[PDB]
Amino acid sequence: MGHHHHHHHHSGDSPAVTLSAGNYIIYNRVLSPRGEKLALTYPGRQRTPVTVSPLDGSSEQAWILRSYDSNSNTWTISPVGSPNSQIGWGAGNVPVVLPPNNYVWTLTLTSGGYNIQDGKRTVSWSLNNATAGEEVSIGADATFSGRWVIEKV
Numbered sequence: 001m002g003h004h005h006h007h008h009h010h011s012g013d014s015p016a017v018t019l020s021a022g023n024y025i026i027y028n029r030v031l032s033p034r035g036e037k038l039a040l041t042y043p044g045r046q047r048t049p050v051t052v053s054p055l056d057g058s059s060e061q062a063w064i065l066r067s068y069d070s071n072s073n074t075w076t077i078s079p080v081g082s083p084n085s086q087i088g089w090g091a092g093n094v095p096v097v098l099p100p101n102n103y104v105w106t107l108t109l110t111s112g113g114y115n116i117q118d119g120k121r122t123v124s125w126s127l128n129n130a131t132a133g134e135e136v137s138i139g140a141d142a143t144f145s146g147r148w149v150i151e152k153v
């Protein structure tokens with residue numbers, strides 16, 4: 001393991017970011033048929049499934065990330081417009097928004113993207129039509145409907 005500056009590089013062969021305590025946006029690695037990003041969006045109330053839609057940077061499309069552990073790479077996630085609650089799991093194979101207790105999620109970086117999984121790695125966050133207005137889902141991973149990208153705001 002190593003690097004150099006006259007016969008090697010990093011800025012064109014490997015990622016250049018990492019997660020930290022702050023405000024972020026989360027969108028699918030496959031965009032949408034609209035020719036634009038497909039990002040997590042607040043469903044308009046509490047105790048409902050998370051939804052996915054186009055992105056403009058609005059208070060219902062932007063989120064926060066906060067650490068919970070380091071031995072398990074687990075964090076908590078909340079919308080910037082309703083941080084009095086956070087993303088949780090309705091036990092019905094879909095994510096929901098609910099007041100805080102101890103609900104957490106696992107994040108992973110790769111050579112050209114991000115991933116989002118449960119605390120036991122048995123499942124991953126995914127979609128079924130990869131289009132706006134769809135409710136987010138949880139199940140086995142998928143090459144073009146179960147991978148993500150994350151950016152700081």
Ligand SMILES: CO[C@@H]1O[C@H](CO)[C@@H](O[C@@H]2O[C@H](CO)[C@@H](O)[C@H](O)[C@H]2NC(C)=O)[C@H](O[C@@H]2O[C@@H](C)[C@@H](O)[C@@H](O)[C@@H]2O)[C@H]1NC(C)=O
Pocket residue numbers: 088089090091092098101102103104105106117118119120
């Ligand atoms: C007190 O510890 C926390 O307890 C809650 C339930 O009150 C756990 O959330 C539940 O986890 C079940 C699987 O372990 C799952 O079937 C159920 O849907 C889920 N309920 C809710 C409302 O999310 C917490 O479990 C962690 O967070 C969830 C979201 C998931 O990622 C799970 O894999 C994690 O272990 C649990 N929190 C902690 C920090 O242990």
